[PDB]
Amino acid sequence: GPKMFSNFTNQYPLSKTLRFELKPVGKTLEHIEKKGLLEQDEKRAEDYKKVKKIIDEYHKDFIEEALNNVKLNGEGLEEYYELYFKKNKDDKDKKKKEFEKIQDNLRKQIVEAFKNHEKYKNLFKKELKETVEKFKNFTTYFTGFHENRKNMYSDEEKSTAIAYRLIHENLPKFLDNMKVFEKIKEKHPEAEQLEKTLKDLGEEEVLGGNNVEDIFSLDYFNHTLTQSGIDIYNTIIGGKTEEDGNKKIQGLNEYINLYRQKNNEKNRKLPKLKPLYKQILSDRESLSFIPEAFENDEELLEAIEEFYENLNFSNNNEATNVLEKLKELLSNLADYDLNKIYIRNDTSLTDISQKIFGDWSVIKDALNAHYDQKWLKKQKYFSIAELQEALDSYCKESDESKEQKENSIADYFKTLAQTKNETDKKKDVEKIKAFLDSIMNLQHFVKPLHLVKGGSAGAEMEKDEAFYSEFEALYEELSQVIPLYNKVRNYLTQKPYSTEKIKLNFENSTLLDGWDVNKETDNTSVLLRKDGLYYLGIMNKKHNKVFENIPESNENDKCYEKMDYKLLPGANKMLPKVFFSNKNIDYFNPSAEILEIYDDCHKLIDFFKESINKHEDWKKFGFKFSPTSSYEDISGFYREVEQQGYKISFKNISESYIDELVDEGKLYLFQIYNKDFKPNLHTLYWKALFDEENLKDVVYKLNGEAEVFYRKAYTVDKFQFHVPITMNFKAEGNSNINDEVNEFLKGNAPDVNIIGIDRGERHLLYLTLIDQKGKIVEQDSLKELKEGYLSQVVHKIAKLMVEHNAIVVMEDLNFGFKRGRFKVEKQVYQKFEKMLIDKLNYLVDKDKEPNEPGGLLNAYQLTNKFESFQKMGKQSGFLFYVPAWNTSKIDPTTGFVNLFHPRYENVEKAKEFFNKFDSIRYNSEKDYFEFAFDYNNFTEKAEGTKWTVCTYGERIKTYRNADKNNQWDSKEVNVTEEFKNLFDEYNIDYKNGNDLKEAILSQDDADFFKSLLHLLRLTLQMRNSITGTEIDYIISPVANENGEFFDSRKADESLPKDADANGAYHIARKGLWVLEQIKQTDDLKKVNLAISNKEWLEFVQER
Ligand SMILES: [Mg+2]
Ligand SMILES: [Mg+2]
């Protein structure tokens, strides 16, 4: 259709992965249910699991034997306990680092007795009792498992290290138990429940060789190191089942839980005791007991109760209640200095913005408009004082002239700490989830004040002591939810089934099989079609030769159609392997000193061409080479050998034979079918793989590999099929079409339209297809919600392209700033951009003729591949990029923009600001005030931009942010009448038409200039919207050279009819500058396409 788009048909090969649903046919369901998947691999995996279990048992017994000999005196824990419970590490970092060094020394002492002990294990013998004497072998990756076990033996300060669990994680629990016991030692003065019932019962195996207090001695840590020590500790701390089986002796926790006879306030809030953790503890095997998924609800309840006790505690040894301590500390932020407390620059600044002001973008514009202008020198951490200074002057978009912010950040923190709900204090899943979500909310709220790692991109200047020293130690006690919550997300949400992957490989019909490359047979599968429904034909590895020497039996029987795949892969790597690198080279007789190594290239190509005719199967491809002695470097010729090698032929096979095969069980047959098997593109591509109009000149190629996905739980329900195909297989390597798109854009620009896409404030994305003369032609747009929308707007963009002969001008996120409340998140726009280029990479229309320039066999390729390049222009074919900007505030008729930036400040600045205006006159004939000025005195503009702002009126003003005292209410305000009222109130005359600058420059009242600046900022406010409704129009204060004022409500269809279409019409208008630059350039290989706010403002303003 279009003249330019016709030439962009075969630009570069593309790769896709088709997705289909398979339903088993006949006995296949029963066979896959009973026999399962490939049985040899299942048996190999079972034997591997058995030998791994044997190895794990041997490792566990060796570990226990080695740990049974370690002594405390040699380790040195006796002097380590005092340093551990001295708790002085918090006060000084030197003590903490000394403690860490001592811990490292102790862990080294622990691990140095592991490797060499007990013959260094005999796992090497097990690598070579029936399952270990002989097995499947198959050189499995047992080296990785051995390395993992060695790292588990190591001391790399990881969860796999034994010493990490025994000193870093068990020992704190031991010390906490000691500190509890030294206070509750008198819990059993009668000693009848202490020794008469426990010391003789729980130690029957050792014949009572120890006592209850023996475990409560610091010098007997070595006893609890072994698994038996942990077992006896758990039995003595939480009861034992006993040999009787029904007595169920109560543990220490139950013993202290009977303290309800002391109902006074000093008996409750009892901290639950901490049983010691045990490795290799599970129903079958735990492998050091990583608690990533737990075992049952019992351990989950134990962990939840443990954290609940650790958080609230009992207000002993100072206020240990983290919930109220953190609230008080945050409420104390105002007193602390704000010059050194830091705030994260991440998305948290949005959440702070939404609470203080109600506008999620107030803070983000304030930093990027007043603090700094370059790339802002983006740093990771801000400061409280800098944020307060920036928010103390942010142009006051629409609010009271003076805002009672005071210490806004500190007020926000202290109000959200305790005044947010006043309900911070609190087996069922509902209660646990509510508690975890409340802690999630608290942690997210307190996260901005936290310092991430150390020295993050500099900053990290000397912080205050009295606040940050407390906060860093306080946050870690509360940050423990983030991993623990994961366990809840990992245990309570688990699927009973598992997703398994099978790799398929369609059987090539060439003589390549077995001759040169037979590295991996995988699961060779065939492809069958009967009446238009294609099938998948997986065959068992035991019966690969079923489809060989099949004579079709007799005729007159119904026949399946079977594909005969013929592919020649990797011509450059495979062709010289057969000819003069292996396979009886002396038969072909190349001579010519084997062409040296691998006009010499042309001679080698001629030798290849003449030797191909010698081969029998390779001749059946019908090779049609280019004329001899016309090639580039030999590799290019290989392309032809690879390009003409692929061929698909369909033969007939007896249906009765196939049915007998599927009944026996040698053939897993799955019917390939989508739900509508609405013509999908994937169905269109699949039916074009075996199309007669496609196989004469291949455009779609079946790669050869495929994956089938199922939902094994011994029953299988869901089946999936992933087929990677190659589109535009016989396509020239003309990638990066930018060098050719610009040629046409220079050639025939006067017929090119432009499509502009903007992130609106009301609508997500807004389009505006403008002509070459600035006239709008058509304005549109209004995992399941966002993806469904982005898959519909992309279809409209890709339809307006070919239909209206237009180009697309998008926005570049990482090269600018958007000063507004754009409704599209960064992660949603960055995926719409990906889904737009992917749609324009291979754009095909079903209704078009297959050979038409936009049909199936000739598909538009309008953009290059999705590259991660971050440059100035980044022109992707016909899709241009411009720096992100808030273009909605520009006047389409004359390009006027509000660059005044007036705000209430000291009276001297207000007096000086209004002296720069040329006139403050009052046109009584048309009844509005005319501010005549020039932008040179206000900014660094071109000095030739003399405007005339007229107070036309009918503007919408937003009061404030909260409900009643503050209010989001928006009032339609008559600017002219308000100006007249203000001037009449303060004894100023304007009815005579005289200049009002002298009178304005005389009044010294602070309130008068406040109202004057508020009204002047109202007049220049163009984009004004009623909150919660669809009233959003662009009123223009400046003239139009004919005594007219732009008004989107009264505007015709040539100009934007909405305040959001003005943001998309001024992005499409940026594209016009791109077209003019392309037309007015002479390089076409190094051409600038960077939009700068200076040059484009001159461009629009000459309209
Ligand atoms: Mg925009
Ligand atoms: Mg906009």
Of 470, 491, 512, which residue constitutes the final position of a domain?
491
Distance (Å) from CA 1069 to ligand 2 centroid: 13
Return residues with CB closer than 5 A to ligand 2 (ion).
Answer: 758, 888, 1063
> Nearest Cα to 883, choosing from 1073, 667, 1041?
1073
Which neighbouring-strand residues pair with 880?
Answer: 809
Cβ contact 857:870 at 8 Å = no
Cβ contact 388:367 at 8 Å = no
Q: CA 1079, 1083, 1087, 1092 torsion: positive or negative?
A: negative
State the CB neighbour count (10 A cutoff) for residue 922: 22
Distance, CA of 70 to CA of 214 (rounded, Å): 18
Q: Is residue 695, in this structure, part of any structural domain at all? A: yes
Cβ contact 179:85 at 8 Å = yes
**DSSP string over 28-40:** HHHHHHHT-S-HH
Co-location of 641 and 765 in the same domain: no
Distance, CA of 476 to CA of 495 (rounded, Å): 32
Cβ contact 1034:1046 at 8 Å = yes
Specify the DSSP class assigned to residue 934.
-
Of 727, 747, 769, which residue constitutes the final position of a domain?
727
Ligand nearest to the CA of 1023: 2
Distance (Å) from CA 834 to ligand 2 centroid: 21
803 SS3 class: helix
Residue 290 makes CB contacts below 8 A (sequence gap 6+) with 159
**DSSP string over 1028-1071:** TSS-EEEB--B--SSS---BTTT--SSS-SSTTHHHHHHHHHHH
Co-location of 397 and 455 in the same domain: yes
Residue 813 makes CB contacts below 8 A (sequence gap 6+) with 826, 829, 830, 884
Return residues with CB closer than 5 A to ligand 1 (ion).
Answer: 758, 1063
Co-location of 795 and 864 in the same domain: yes
Co-location of 326 and 390 in the same domain: yes
> Nearest Cα to 710, choosing from 37, 231, 17, 34?
37
Co-location of 266 and 328 in the same domain: no
- The beta strand positions in 345-473, using DSSP E, are 381-383
Our CA dihedral for 161, 163, 168, 174, rounded to 10 degrees, sits at 130
Task: Give me the domain span that covers residue 630.
Answer: 501-727
CATH number for the domain that contains residue 820:
3.30.420
- The beta strand positions in 738-799, using DSSP E, are 753-759, 765-770, 776-780
Distance, CA of 1009 to CA of 1001 (rounded, Å): 10
Q: Is residue 31, in this structure, part of any structural domain at all? A: no
Co-location of 827 and 917 in the same domain: no
> What is the greatest pairwise CA distance in the chain?
115
Q: Is residue 155, in this structure, part of any structural domain at all? A: no
Co-location of 515 and 637 in the same domain: yes
> Nearest Cα to 466, choosing from 559, 633, 606, 340?
340
- The beta strand positions in 542-655, using DSSP E, are 559-566, 647-654
Strands 765-770 and 559-566: unpaired
Distance, CA of 797 to CA of 993 (rounded, Å): 53
C-alpha triplet 571, 574, 578: angle, nearest 5° = 125
Place of tokens 């000394």: 98
Q: Is residue 601, in this structure, part of any structural domain at all? A: yes
Q: By what method was this entry solved?
A: cryo-EM
Tokens, residue 64: 């226990």
Distance, CA of 760 to CA of 821 (rounded, Å): 8
Distance, CA of 757 to CA of 754 (rounded, Å): 10
Cβ contact 754:769 at 8 Å = yes
Ligand nearest to the CA of 813: 1
Ligand nearest to the CA of 1060: 2
Co-location of 601 and 721 in the same domain: yes
Distance (Å) from CA 377 to ligand 1 centroid: 23
Distance, CA of 198 to CA of 182 (rounded, Å): 19
How big is the chain by its Cα radius of gyration, in Å? 39
Place of tokens 């991996």: 520
Q: Is residue 717, in this structure, part of any structural domain at all? A: yes
C-alpha triplet 197, 199, 204: angle, nearest 5° = 105
Tokens, residue 414: 């202290």
Which neighbouring-strand residues pair with 22?
Answer: 672
Distance, CA of 958 to CA of 973 (rounded, Å): 10
Distance (Å) from CA 762 to ligand 2 centroid: 9
State the CB neighbour count (10 A cutoff) for residue 1016: 22
Q: Is residue 1028, in this structure, part of any structural domain at all? A: no
Distance, CA of 352 to CA of 355 (rounded, Å): 6
Distance, CA of 193 to CA of 257 (rounded, Å): 14
Place of tokens 């932008």: 935
Distance, CA of 223 to CA of 211 (rounded, Å): 12
Phi, psi dihedrals of residue 848, rounded to the nearest 5°: -70, 155
Residue 1101 makes CB contacts below 8 A (sequence gap 6+) with 894, 895, 896, 897, 945
Of 463, 491, 519, which residue constitutes the final position of a domain?
491
847 SS3 class: coil
Residue 520 makes CB contacts below 8 A (sequence gap 6+) with 505
Q: Is residue 236, in this structure, part of any structural domain at all? A: yes
Co-location of 584 and 646 in the same domain: yes
Cβ contact 526:539 at 8 Å = yes
By residue count, the chain amounts to 1103
**DSSP string over 585-596:** HHHH---HHHHS
Co-location of 923 and 981 in the same domain: yes
Tokens, residue 454: 């150390």
Here the contacts of 621-624 (C-beta below 8 Å, separation 24 or greater) are 621/566, 621/568, 621/645, 621/647
C-alpha triplet 978, 984, 987: angle, nearest 5° = 145
Distance (Å) from CA 759 to ligand 1 centroid: 5
Co-location of 525 and 637 in the same domain: yes
Distance, CA of 3 to CA of 750 (rounded, Å): 13
CB-side exposure of 609: number of CA atoms within 13 Å? 17
Taking 3-state DSSP, the helix, strand and coil percentages for the chain, each rounded to the nearest 5, stand at 40, 15, 45
Cβ contact 236:254 at 8 Å = no
Co-location of 791 and 698 in the same domain: no
860 SS3 class: strand
Q: How many domains does the chain have?
A: 5
Distance (Å) from CA 765 to ligand 2 centroid: 9
Instruction: Write a three-state SS string for 1069-1084.
Output: HHHHHHHHHHHCCCCC
Cβ contact 565:573 at 8 Å = no
Q: Is residue 1035, in this structure, part of any structural domain at all? A: no
Residue 516 makes CB contacts below 8 A (sequence gap 6+) with 574, 577, 578, 582, 583
Distance, CA of 858 to CA of 49 (rounded, Å): 53
Looking at the chain, after which residues does the C atom sit over 2.5 Å from the next written N, breaking the chain?
A: 128, 373, 426, 598, 677, 713, 782, 1101
Distance, CA of 730 to CA of 725 (rounded, Å): 13
Ligand nearest to the CA of 890: 2
